[PDB]
Amino acid sequence: MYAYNGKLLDVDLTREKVKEVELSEDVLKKFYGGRGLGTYILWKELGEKWEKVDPLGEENLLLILTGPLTGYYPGMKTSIVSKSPESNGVVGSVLSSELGLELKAAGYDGIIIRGKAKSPVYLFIHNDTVEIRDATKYWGMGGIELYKTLLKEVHEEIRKKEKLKGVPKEPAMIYIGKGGENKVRFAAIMTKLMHAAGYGGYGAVMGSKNLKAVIAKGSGPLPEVYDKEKMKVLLREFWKELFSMTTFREWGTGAGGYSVGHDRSSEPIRNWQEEYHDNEEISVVNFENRTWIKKYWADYGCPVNCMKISYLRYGPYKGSISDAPDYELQAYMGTNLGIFEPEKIVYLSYLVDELGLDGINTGNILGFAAELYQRGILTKEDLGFELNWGDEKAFAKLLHLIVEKEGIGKILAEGTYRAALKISEIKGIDVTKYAVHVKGIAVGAHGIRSELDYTKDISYAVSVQGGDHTSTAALPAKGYTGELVEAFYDSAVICNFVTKPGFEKIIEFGNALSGFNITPEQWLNEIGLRIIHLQRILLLLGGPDVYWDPRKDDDNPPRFYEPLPSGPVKGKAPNREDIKAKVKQYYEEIGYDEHGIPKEEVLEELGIGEAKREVKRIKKRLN
């Protein structure tokens, strides 16, 4: 076919068996790829027993996916989809690994990873060769050492193999750190030190299957495309337009650490107790002059080059390496902990990258703990040390308790939602009022109270990915912002930052690749909608330990109803009954009933009628 190989790898780590499975054109026209394709596979294989599947057990599926735009659209993303250890629903995460490109160049569109290896393994894919290999020497390594050993050794192996064909480029590698190895709930899947499949806890899923890394190298062409000269014309168009985004190419998201708090008053400061600051220490000019050793860094075929590398050659944290750091790390590993200095923020960002922990949910649990310490709820005896705002060494000590699940680390390693329930139970006090999460996922570093940011009222409240600021809901529920357009980019799969040409132009590019005739209206009313409904269903079915009730859990954390205590919109916060009105309105526009459960009529019009079986179980454990 066009744009796809029409093929997935199917890897049973339990039986140590690999096979190829066909991707029908029917499935691809219905679900496209990435997030959509993974949601289908998960519902198809697990939806009947969903509430019994432990995300950290042998029966979960880890899906590594691409989409038709995967090799051809500017920039580079690989999609990762699984049952989430955080929400017990599904998260379409992405990361800028060339893994998806190398898979496509090797003949595949993705990997279904089943079961659980008896000992640490890694998956090695080189053109037609696929092997499950012992990884016990690398279990315990962070990313830097993993590149210097495992990745280097595999590249030399491949170079010896192809001595007479020349020197192949390096293979792509996704991997976990010690956080995923020890099943910390908010562990990430990493690539190239600094890129993450961040939301969802998939580092813990990967770690729970004893999978250290996936390494892939392809040397053939990408699948052919339907209209090659329309592809070339649009590509030149897209490059010219993307080259013009001067400040985003020069600074990336690294201007956010100052600008989100100062300009939009929507940045978490000390576990969201404030959302405004005027602290110029954290301005990008200081990250650049004090830490940036590479100002322009790009993923495959990317004209934006939004990435940067920060590196510390001085001070006690000498050796720390991170990116700009990304704004979400500047906020959650910085201002959310009361820390405004680049040197300390690069240090803490380096630690979560090296440990393979999602910086958002990590900073959220750390700021949560620090607020409990400030309020006397967690004592110096509970922690083992003082946990003051601004003290980067106290926060690094806590990070290492979490990854080793030592002392209080064993509770915190379960994530903010579960920890706040456990501590509430233990202390006889409601500490869930300090947990800033939605559906068990830490709220991304864009608050709703100021209404000066893109996030407001129901953005997180009704979303099938909860606190995930990269896939928020909007009103109108269709229309070019909101879950449906975001589900597209996560199914393409393409990088968000490279969508300047616009949703329609990008669908048009996709049709020129694939030979499909998908329209924006069909995405918004059918393909996108059925992805969102299946994710809503799996999220409402919930996991074995935590279940959501839309009448309770389609809401903002209560801190978001307290008036902002500072800044140029001091006193502002949304009103709880206005949110409920908007939640009700979102339900109708998206096709959920009045309780927020997808309408069975809608499910049949969408072609996923057999999901009514799942809706009935929802309604039972509902009424």
Binding site: G71, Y72, L101, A105, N127, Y147, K148, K152, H155, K163, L164, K165, G166, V167, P168, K169, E170, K192, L193, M194, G218, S219, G220, P221, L222, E224, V225, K228, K232, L235, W239, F243, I293, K294, Y296, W297, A298, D299, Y300, G301, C302, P303, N305, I309, Y311, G319
Partner: protein, 166 residues
Amino acid sequence: AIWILITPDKCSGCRLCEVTCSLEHEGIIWPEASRIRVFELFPGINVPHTCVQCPDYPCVNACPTNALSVDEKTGAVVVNEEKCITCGACVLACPGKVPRIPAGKGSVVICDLCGGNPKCVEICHEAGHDALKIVTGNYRPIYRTFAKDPQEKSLDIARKVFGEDF
């Protein structure tokens, strides 16, 4: 006469040079068929790698079936793909391990300087990186010393940036 001068520390790894070259020469995106290939053995250390037009053309003189010749106008190697038996002799003769046989192609690929107007340099300049630049005079013998194993260049750069901590 043109020669591509490479500044590895200006390379962002955008690999738009790879996309332009493979689209131009294969009509399809095909990283390992690009005649300029960027090596990123450690994140952030990006080493673009291509032919330097050795005045003694080790590749051309090692080819057993005479699939390789030298363009008279530009000094570039030209591949007759139908004569190539993918034996790897040019791969081994090259001081920089530059000739590349991509999977399923049936022929080596080597930079042909785009007939005298490198499209890789154009896109690299338009992106503002300028890791690739054209020099226009007569060939200088020091150009040939730029044909070096990409792994040696990467390790040199990594050590220069990260020091004893690498």
